[PDB]
């Protein structure tokens, strides 16, 4: 039998308490929604691979014990755990599978303790793991109802015990008890663990309450990548998809002969260090196993190549330098050690690939009387270049006097030999040393590894190897023209893109298997759980080739676009507004087609329209709307301060002393942050403090029907803000702050309190509603609000009579607009997006900065205190300085991002100051600057780290068609409108303003004369009153 | 590091020295990516202007 594991196989990853924190783990877990085997144990009539999850819904504990091993047939030792009425017994012995086993020959571990096995049956969850000879048990008891097998119940397994088993385990089997042999039935559940990434949610009590399987479905993948159990509607860029290779191909030249390593390991007698022997070895196979153990060695230190990989490396040409050296000089053979022998006998290059083998030769070289046959030279005018020998035994004159002939006094000729004696040599003992040096991937390889060639495959991406050149990708016939000497094909990125087959003369291209970005398009996690997957710039004929979740790749619904191809959305012919942009004009939405589904479509750019253009047709509005629109502008951000000592070094004296050398970096960081904070105060001052005096609204708030109660401050509330200001303050939401403070990242309060910012705003409001634009220029001059409104009307080319003749209507429109602002602010939380996301950016930056402290930066650990406790200074300080460099780089990155963010905030604050100067302190003519339509005035409202402008705009509406003429010819002379336009209702002509239909009789004051009617194109005939 | 290609580093080195080279290589490439992203942020600020 088989079934589905809904929420089983979760345990506490480690013995550590947490609280209200979403933690990502990567470890052995039972995958979510897995094929769990439902076993039945009946009397009337299992591989232990990568951990095992065992569940028992048993009553009266028939199932008792388990066995663990590789064969369980006394081929090696084995485990058994078994339990009975009072206790449990664990044994590690040579067991022949006490009916369970026959004999126990050699026993290594025994254990007795409290038993682990303690129709309303209960689930007794166990997790068994073994890693590096350590066997861990996790367990949990959950009493369950009589509903059905494996309910939707969730609970983690607390750790019980770990045992040092130290034994190869491949298979396990469980054990049953019988009370005879009465017939009966039982049942258990088996699951297999896999290396998976989980997200665990901790409650206030630190119990793992919920989990998300990141590598199960795209939705959970987005959940794991955002580290949240709820995902907002949109598109999220998840892990990259990669077509995995099929097999491995190795191609080598057909070389079978062995490299003569025999003569270099044991010759008649090795050439001396001054005349060290070299030969090129090539065109053979190199292996160390047969010959290394024959001449046993004591110093094998290798630099570029591990000894085990040397058999798996394919060479071009190799050299060995074999010579007799003094024992005590065995440590001079490493690159860069200098001395008499280094500068005059032998030296190897500082940067090379190769290593040395040294072993004893006293019993074969040393003589009782002294073996003075191995020459070594100490004296020469010039040093010895690496990999060079000199055999000129020219007389050397140490003294300043001239030295001629064969020898002379104060002349030290290069003739001295070793005093090698068998027993007297301890550190003076001769050592015969062979240094193997080689060059890889510079020339075509000849001396290659024992590894055998493989058959050549094409149009299937593979792990291809060509004479040590390793890559992965598809192989194709080459249109490039190689030459006999040419071996490799290089790209712009200095990465190999072509190969020559070492077996034949054929040349091949390289193209790694298809890949590209993966995006997940989801609605609100609350709204739905079905998602769409976009494969960016990938042909949808290749994702079937990519057939770890494969369920969506077999989808019944595929749509191809320029951005890539989409799976899980139905393409439609209809055009809607874009909500989730895909790219290249494709947008995704979620609606009913009666079932709900995700759809993809071509985004509409709005409703199609055709303007009724003609020779002489004009559209003049007859009505208006006083539209109040909110414009939100960030003005300042949270003034941040950082201490190097607290953040980088915590409270360590040693770290402080190692850091004070980087004082320049810390002073520049502090200077930059102080500049940013003073700039935030300057931003607030420039935006708000534009007024010399604090004005007060009069107690009699009579403004010709304009009721500013929702924007003027309310004395009733302690905080002297307005209704709209209070709503804005409540909408923006400002533990992790305590951790930020404890890690040395502090928030300096703004110079201006919210109360004084509100007082500045109230002064601006009072000045605007009582004086108008005058208080911006010089002394505030009082003026009735009606007259100010008439002036603002005159500003937008509307005659002031319009407002006075419609005063009550305009006042009611403004009041209803303020009501709509209140309703919109109270209802939706998406109103103050900009301020909220600015706060979120600052919070995310500080959270990222505090999370960087968990980074190791290549050190032993990310906590300095344990480094100091467990290490003496001489490497404690090098670990600390690496940690300091890492954290200082993190601080520099944070400060740079803060400088760029502060620059963008300063741009916003300059724009806000300009808007307060041009929209609040006056009427602006700049189109769409102070709101959509003809700007009349603006009202500032303080908001958390920003301002809100209530842009009052005139918007024409209820337009009507009219016949129009560019001019009027009355007495043979053209007439033009002084300030207006000519329109005809069908019988008579009238002059009217451009933004409000109001006809007037054509008289000599509405019109001015210019030239005659035989030049102007489109002039008409009418009469003009004197 | 010994070289600029990871594959040869993995082929020629046993895990510890391989990783002590690879971490330096990752720090270098991450610094290059950070420099690119910072220059892109400044360029995007000027483009936004
Ligand atoms: C210009 O547009 C104004 C609205 O934008 C419009 O005011 C509206 O006029 C209509 C008709 O007179 C009123 O409609 C209501 O009339 C009575 C009394 O309120 C109600 O019992 C009816 O049910 C009906 O809804 C609107 O109340 C009124 N709107 C406002 C805000 O006052 C002007 O009349 C338009 N001007 C011209 C010249 O057409
Ligand atoms: C100026 O405009 C104000 C905003 O429209 C308006 O305030 C509103 O006044 C009414 C009273 O007429 C209040 O109505 C409420 O009264 C009681 C006490 O709060 C409540 O229990 C009732 O349920 C009812 O809602 C409004 O609360 C109040 N505010 C709002 C937002 O509507 C003034 O009355 C106007 N005054 C003048 C002189 O024009
Ligand atoms: C397991 O136990 C058996 C029996 O004591 C051991 O077998 C003996 O091994 C020694 C040493 O090789 C021999 O001299 C004896 O002749 C063996 N006797 C028998 C009866 O086989 C065996 O060595 C033990 N194994 C381990 C790993 O300790
Ligand atoms: C965290 O653990 C505590 C104690 O186990 C829980 O506190 C109990 O909660 C229940 C339900 O609200 C109350 O009836 C008890 O009086 C509480 N006991 C105590 C000692 O405080 C708490 O509920 C747990 N948290 C959750 C989310 O269940
Ligand atoms: C996906 O692959 C197909 C081929 O299977 C591409 O179709 C080719 O497109 C090129 C360029 O437009 C034409 O020259 C070929 O004649 C087409 N071949 C066939 C068989 O139709 C298709 O263009 C690819 N998708 C995208 C988005 O480029
Ligand atoms: C001004 O007149 C033009 C044409 O006389 C109007 O345009 C027509 O509008 C009707 C709907 O009212 C459509 O069914 C026609 O297709 C339109 N025809 C053309 C040629 O555009 C126009 O609507 C009038 N202006 C206003 C404001 O009503
Ligand atoms: C065009 O507008 C003029 C406005 O003068 C209209 O002419 C008036 O129509 C009213 C109808 O009650 C008469 O009482 C006036 O005596 C007319 N005055 C003049 C000077 O003619 C004319 O009817 C309008 N034409 C339309 C709407 O087609
Ligand atoms: C406006 O009226 C004048 C005269 O009242 C028109 O001018 C006449 O045009 C006709 C031919 O169209 C000529 O034969 C006359 O000699 C012209 N008379 C004068 C005095 O110039 C004029 O055409 C009318 N406007 C339009 C646009 O038709
Ligand atoms: C579980 O695996 C078995 C053996 O391959 C198979 O027969 C069975 O259909 C699988 N069950 C599920 C639910 O996948
Ligand atoms: C359980 O088994 C152990 C192992 O032999 C034994 O010593 C113990 O007496 C047993 N207890 C019961 C109650 O069967
Ligand atoms: C290389 O040698 C093998 C057998 O050693 C042979 O099968 C193959 O044909 C040779 N290569 C060429 C190009 O002839
Ligand atoms: C999901 O929608 C419901 C309304 O049905 C609402 O109560 C809830 O807050 C929403 N959750 C999220 C995360 O948007
Ligand atoms: C969308 O339009 C194309 C082109 O007319 C058509 O082939 C396709 O069937 C349409 N899709 C649907 C769902 O009707
Ligand atoms: C505009 O006026 C000219 C000259 O009177 C005429 O030729 C043309 O047809 C008119 N335009 C239209 C769209 O009728």
**What are the DSSP calls for A928-988, one per residue?**
TTSSSSEEEE--EEEETTEEEEEEEEEEEEEEEEEEEES-EESSSSEEEESSSEEEESSSS
Count CB-CB contacts under 10 A for residue B36.
Answer: 10
Measure the CA–CA gap between A958 and B9, rounded to whole angstroms: 76
Segment (H or E) for A678: helix A663-688
Largest pairwise CA distance in chain A: 146
Measure the CA–CA gap between A86 and A90, rounded to whole angstroms: 14
Ligand 9 first shell, C-beta below 6 A: A 2, 35
Spatial contact of A493 and A480, defined as CB atoms under 8 Å apart: no
Token representation of residue A8 = 């089983």
Measure the CA–CA gap between A994 and A986, rounded to whole angstroms: 19
Measure the CA–CA gap between A920 and A1003, rounded to whole angstroms: 39
- Residue A380 contacts by C-beta under 8 Å, 6 or more apart in sequence? A344, A390, A396, A414
| Nearest-neighbour CA in chain B from A306: distance (Å) | 5
Closest residue in A to B25 (Cα) is: A858
A441, A893, A897 ranked by CB distance to B8: nearest: A441
Spatial contact of A1003 and A1025, defined as CB atoms under 8 Å apart: yes
Nearest Cα residue to A471 out of A250, A239, A285, A252: A250
Q: How many residues does chain B have?
A: 49
Between CA A286 and CA A298, with CA A292 as vertex, the angle to 5 degrees is: 135
Q: Is A813 helix (H, G, I), strand (E, B) or coil?
A: helix
| Nearest ligand 3 atom, CA A94 | 1
Segment (H or E) for A41: strand A34-42
Count CB-CB contacts under 10 A for residue A498.
Answer: 20
Between CA A98 and CA A161, with CA A172 as vertex, the angle to 5 degrees is: 85
Residues 5-44 of B with CB under 8 A from A: 5, 7-8, 11-14, 17, 23-24, 27, 31, 34, 38, 41-42
C-alpha distance from residue A829 to each of A106, A824, A843, A926, A949 (Å): 73, 9, 19, 31, 18
Q: Is A8 helix (H, G, I), strand (E, B) or coil?
A: coil
CB contact under 8 A, A900 and B45: yes
Q: Is the CB of A828 under 6 A from ligand 5?
A: no
Count CB-CB contacts under 10 A for residue A504.
Answer: 9
Ligand 13 centroid distance, CA of A574 (Å):
9
Strands A1020-1021 and A570-571: unpaired
Q: What is the 3-class SS of A568-614, one letter each residue?
A: CCEECCCCCCCCEEEECCEEEEEEECCCEEEEEEECCCCCCCCCCCC
Helix axes A754-770, A723-731, angle to 10 degrees: 140
Token look-up 């979740």 returns A549
Q: How many residues does chain A have?
A: 1026
Q: Is A56 helix (H, G, I), strand (E, B) or coil?
A: strand
Q: Residue A841 carries which DSSP code?
A: H
Spatial contact of A53 and A193, defined as CB atoms under 8 Å apart: yes
Token representation of residue A543 = 């994702």
- Residue A217 contacts by C-beta under 8 Å, 6 or more apart in sequence? A531, A549, A551
Ligand 5 centroid distance, CA of A559 (Å):
15
Spatial contact of A472 and A515, defined as CB atoms under 8 Å apart: no
Nearest Cα residue to A460 out of A470, A478, A473, A469: A473
Spatial contact of A625 and A615, defined as CB atoms under 8 Å apart: no
Q: Is A40 helix (H, G, I), strand (E, B) or coil?
A: strand
Token representation of residue A460 = 């299937």
The residue to mutate among A622, A961, A963, A984, having the most atoms of ligand 6 within 8 angstroms of its beta carbon, is: A961
**What are the DSSP calls for A231-282, one per residue?**
--SEEEEEEEEEPPP--EEEE--S--PBP--HHHHS-SSPPBGGG-B--EE-
Spatial contact of A215 and A548, defined as CB atoms under 8 Å apart: yes
CA A63 to chain centre: 47
Measure the CA–CA gap between A117 and A125, rounded to whole angstroms: 10
- Residue A433 contacts by C-beta under 8 Å, 6 or more apart in sequence? A322, A323, A324, A325, A330, A333, A356, A357, A358, A359
- The angstrom resolution of this structure is 3.0
How many distinct helices (H) and strands (E) make up chain A?
Answer: 18, 48
Token representation of residue A969 = 């010819």
Token look-up 């040397």 returns A310
Strands A596-602 and A570-571: parallel
Spatial contact of A475 and A466, defined as CB atoms under 8 Å apart: no
Cα-flanking dihedrals φ and ψ of residue A633, to 5°?
-135, 120
Measure the CA–CA gap between A532 and A769, rounded to whole angstroms: 53
Residue A597 burial by Cβ neighbours in a 10 Å radius (0-12, 13-18, 19+): middle
Token look-up 């003009």 returns A1024
Measure the CA–CA gap between A216 and A549, rounded to whole angstroms: 6
Token representation of residue A367 = 């003589």
Spatial contact of A680 and A686, defined as CB atoms under 8 Å apart: no
Measure the CA–CA gap between A875 and A860, rounded to whole angstroms: 11
Q: Does A897 touch chain B (CB under 8 A)?
A: yes
Q: Does A860 touch chain B (CB under 8 A)?
A: no
CB contact under 8 A, A313 and B11: yes
Nearest Cα residue to A942 out of A775, A718, A727, A743: A727
Measure the CA–CA gap between A966 and A975, rounded to whole angstroms: 9
B17, B31, B45 ranked by CB distance to A904: nearest: B45
Token representation of residue A142 = 């959950």
- Residue B36 contacts by C-beta under 8 Å, 6 or more apart in sequence? none
Strands A63-69 and A78-83: antiparallel
Strands A1007-1009 and A122-131: unpaired
A313, A471, A897 ranked by CB distance to B12: nearest: A313
Residues 351-390 of A with CB under 8 A from B: 353
Q: Is the CB of A572 under 6 A from ligand 13?
A: yes
Residues 466-505 of A with CB under 8 A from B: 468, 470-471, 494-495
- Residue A709 contacts by C-beta under 8 Å, 6 or more apart in sequence? A701, A723
N-terminal to C-terminal alpha carbon distance within chain B: 41
| Nearest ligand 9 atom, CA A37 | 1
Cα-flanking dihedrals φ and ψ of residue A169, to 5°?
-125, 125
Q: What is the 3-class SS of A900-914, one letter each residue?
A: HHHHHHHHHHHHHHH
Count CB-CB contacts under 10 A for residue A977.
Answer: 19
Between CA A280 and CA A282, with CA A281 as vertex, the angle to 5 degrees is: 115
CB contact under 8 A, A309 and B11: yes
Q: Is A823 helix (H, G, I), strand (E, B) or coil?
A: helix
Spatial contact of A379 and A393, defined as CB atoms under 8 Å apart: no
Token representation of residue A173 = 């089997």
Token representation of residue A18 = 């947490």
**What are the DSSP calls for A842-870, one per residue?**
HHHHHHHHHHGGG--TTSS-S-HHHHHHH
Spatial contact of A757 and A942, defined as CB atoms under 8 Å apart: yes
Spatial contact of A619 and A958, defined as CB atoms under 8 Å apart: no
Q: Which residues pair with A299 in a beta bridge?
A: A358
CB contact under 8 A, A900 and B42: yes
Measure the CA–CA gap between A917 and A690, rounded to whole angstroms: 8
Token look-up 């303003």 returns A993
Measure the CA–CA gap between A998 and A981, rounded to whole angstroms: 11
Q: Which residues pair with A56 in a beta bridge?
A: A188
C-alpha distance from residue A899 to each of A667, A892, B48 (Å): 16, 10, 16
CB contact under 8 A, A306 and B14: yes
Q: % helix / strand / coil in chain A, to the nearest 5?
A: 25, 30, 45
CB contact under 8 A, B11 and A896: no
Measure the CA–CA gap between A722 and A288, rounded to whole angstroms: 87
Nearest Cα residue to A1 out of A32, A36, A33: A36
Measure the CA–CA gap between A476 and A456, rounded to whole angstroms: 11
Nearest residue (by CA) to ligand 8, atom 21, is A972
Q: Which residues pair with A633 in a beta bridge?
A: A947
Count CB-CB contacts under 10 A for residue A178.
Answer: 10
Token representation of residue A719 = 């905080």
- Residue A560 contacts by C-beta under 8 Å, 6 or more apart in sequence? A540
| Nearest ligand 13 atom, CA A573 | 1
Q: Does B46 touch chain A (CB under 8 A)?
A: no
Strands (E), A449-556: 462-466, 469-477, 488-490, 496-500, 507-511, 515-522, 532-536
Q: Is A799 helix (H, G, I), strand (E, B) or coil?
A: coil
Nearest residue (by CA) to ligand 7, atom 18, is A988
Spatial contact of A767 and A691, defined as CB atoms under 8 Å apart: yes
Q: What is the 3-class SS of A729-798, one letter each residue?
A: HHHCCCCHHHHHHHCCEEECCCCCCHHHHHHHHHHHHHHHHHCCCHHHHCCCCCCCHHHHHHHHHHHCCC
Q: Residue A284 carries which DSSP code?
A: S
Q: Which residues pair with A482 in a beta bridge?
A: none
Spatial contact of A314 and A283, defined as CB atoms under 8 Å apart: no
CB contact under 8 A, A440 and B27: no
If you compute the radius of gyration of chain B from its CA atoms, what whole number of angstroms results? 16
Token look-up 């070895």 returns A281
Between CA A612 and CA A620, with CA A618 as vertex, the angle to 5 degrees is: 115
Nearest Cα residue to A192 out of A324, A34, A45: A34
């Amino acid at each position: 039998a088989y079934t589905n594991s809904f929420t089983r196989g979760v345990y506490y990853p480690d013995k550590v308490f947490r609280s209200s924190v979403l933690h990502s783990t990567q470890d052995l877990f039972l995958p979510f929604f897995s094929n769990v085997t439902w076993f039945h144990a009946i009397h009337v009539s299992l591989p232990f691979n990568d951990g095992v999850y065992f569940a028992s819904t048993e009553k009266s504990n028939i199932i008792r014990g388990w066995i663990f091993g590789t064969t369980l047939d006394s081929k090696t030792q084995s485990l058994l755990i078994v339990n009975n009425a009072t206790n449990v017994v664990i044994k590690v012995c040579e067991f022949q599978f006490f009916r369970v086993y026959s004999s126990a020959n050699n026993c290594t571990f025994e254990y007795v303790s409290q038993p682990f096995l303690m129709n309303f049956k209960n689930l007794r969850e166990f997790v068994f793991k073994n890693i590096d000879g350590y066997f861990k048990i996790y367990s949990k008891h959950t009493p369950i109802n009589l509903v059905r097998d494996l309910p939707q119940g969730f609970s983690a397994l607390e750790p019980l015990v770990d045992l040092p088993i130290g034994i190869n385990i491949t298979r396990f089997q469980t054990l049953l008890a019988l009370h005879g042999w009465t017939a009966g039935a039982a049942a258990y559940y088996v699951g297999y663990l896999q290396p998976r990434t989980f997200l665990l949610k901790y409650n206030e009590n630190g119990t793992i309450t919920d989990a998300v399987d990141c590598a199960l479905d795209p939705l959970s993948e987005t959940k794991c990548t955002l580290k949240s159990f709820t995902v907002e509607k949109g598109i999220y860029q998840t892990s990259n998809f990669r077509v995995q290779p099929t097999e491995s191909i190795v191609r080598f030249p057909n070389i079978t002969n062995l490299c003569p390593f025999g003569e270099v390991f044991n010759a008649t007698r090795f050439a001396s260090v001054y005349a060290w022997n070299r030969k090129r070895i090539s065109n053979c196979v190199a292996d160390y196993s047969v010959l290394y153990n024959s001449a046993s060695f004591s110093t094998f230190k290798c630099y570029g190549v591990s000894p085990t990989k040397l058999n798996d490396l394919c060479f071009t040409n190799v050299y060995a330098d074999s010579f007799v050296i003094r024992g005590d000089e065995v440590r001079q053979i490493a690159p860069g050690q200098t001395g008499k022998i280094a500068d005059y006998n032998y030296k190897l290059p500082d940067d090379f690939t190769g290593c040395v083998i040294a072993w004893n030769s006293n019993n074969l070289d040393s003589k009782v009387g002294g073996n003075y046959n191995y020459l070594y030279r100490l004296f020469r005018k010039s040093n010895l270049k690496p990999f060079e020998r000199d055999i000129s035994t020219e007389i050397y004159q140490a003294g300043s006097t001239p030295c001629n002939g064969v020898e002379g006094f104060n002349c030290y000729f290069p003739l001295q030999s070793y005093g090698f004696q068998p027993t007297n040599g301890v550190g003076y003992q001769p050592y015969r040393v062979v240094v193997l040096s080689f060059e890889l991937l510079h020339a075509p390889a000849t001396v290659c590894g024992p590894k055998k060639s493989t058959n050549l495959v094409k149009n299937k991406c593979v792990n291809f190897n060509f004479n040590g050149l390793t890559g992965t990708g598809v192989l194709t016939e080459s249109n490039k023209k190689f030459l006999p000497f040419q071996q490799f094909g290089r790209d712009i990125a200095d990465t190999t893109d072509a190969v020559r087959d070492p077996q034949t003369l054929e040349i091949l291209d390289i193209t790694p298997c298809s890949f590209g970005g993966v995006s997940v398009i989801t609605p609100g996690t609350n709204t739905s759980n079905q998602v769409a997957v976009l494969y960016q710039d990938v042909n949808c004929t290749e994702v079937p080739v990519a057939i770890t979740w494969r369920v969506y790749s077999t989808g019944s619904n595929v749509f191809q676009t320029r951005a890539g191809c989409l799976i899980g959305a139905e393409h439609v012919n209809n055009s809607y507004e874009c909500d989730i942009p895909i790219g290249a004009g494709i947008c995704a939405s979620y609606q009913t087609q009666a079932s709900q589904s995700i759809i993809a479509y071509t985004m509409s750019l709005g409703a199609e329209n055709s303007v009724a253009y003609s020779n002489n047709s004009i559209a003049i509005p007859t009505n208006f709307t006083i539209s109040v629109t909110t414009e939100i502008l960030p003005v300042s951000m949270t003034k941040t301060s950082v201490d190097c000592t607290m953040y980088i070094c915590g409270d360590s004296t040693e770290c402080s002393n190692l850091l004070l050398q980087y004082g320049s970096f810390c002073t520049q960081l502090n200077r930059a942050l102080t500049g940013i904070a003073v700039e935030q105060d300057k931003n607030t001052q420039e935006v708000f403090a534009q007024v010399k005096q604090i004005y007060k609204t009069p107690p009699i708030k009579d403004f010709g029907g304009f009721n500013f109660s929702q924007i003027l401050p309310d004395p009733s509330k302690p905080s002297k803000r307005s209704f709209i200001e209070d709503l804005l303050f409540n909408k923006v939401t400002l533990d992790l702050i305590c951790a930020q403070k404890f890690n040395g990242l502090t928030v300096l309060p703004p110079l201006l309190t919210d109360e004084m910012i509100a007082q500045y705003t109230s002064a601006l409001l009072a000045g605007t509603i009582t004086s108008g634009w005058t208080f911006g220029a010089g002394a505030a001059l009082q003026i009735p609000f009606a007259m100010q409104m008439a002036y603002r009307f005159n500003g937008i080319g509307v005659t002031q009579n319009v407002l006075y003749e419609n005063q009550k209507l305009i006042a009611n429109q403004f009041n209803s607009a303020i009501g709509k602002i209140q309703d919109s602010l109270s209802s939706t939380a998406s109103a103050l997006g900009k301020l909220q996301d600015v706060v979120n950016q600052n919070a995310q930056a500080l959270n990222t900065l505090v999370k960087q402290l968990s980074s190791n930066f290549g050190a032993i650990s990310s906590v300095l205190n344990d480094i100091l406790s467990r290490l003496d200074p001489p490497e404690a300080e090098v670990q600390i300085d690496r940690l300091i460099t890492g954290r200082l780089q993190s601080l520099q990155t944070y400060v740079t991002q803060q400088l760029i963010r502060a620059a963008e905030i300063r741009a916003s604050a300059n724009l806000a100051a300009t808007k307060m100067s041009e929209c609040v302190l006056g009427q602006s003519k700049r189109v769409d600057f102070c709101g959509k339509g003809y700007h009349l005035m603006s009202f500032p409202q303080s908001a958390p780290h920003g301002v809100v402008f209530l842009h009052v705009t005139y918007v024409p509406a209820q337009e009507k068609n009219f016949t129009t003429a560019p001019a009027i010819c009355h007495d043979g002379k053209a007439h033009f409108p002084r300030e207006g336009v000519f329109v005809s209702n069908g019988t008579h002509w009238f002059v009217t303003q451009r933004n409000f239909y109001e006809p007037q009789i054509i008289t000599t004051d509405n019109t001015f004369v210019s030239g005659n009617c035989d030049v102007v194109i489109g002039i008409v005939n009418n009469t003009v009153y004197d």
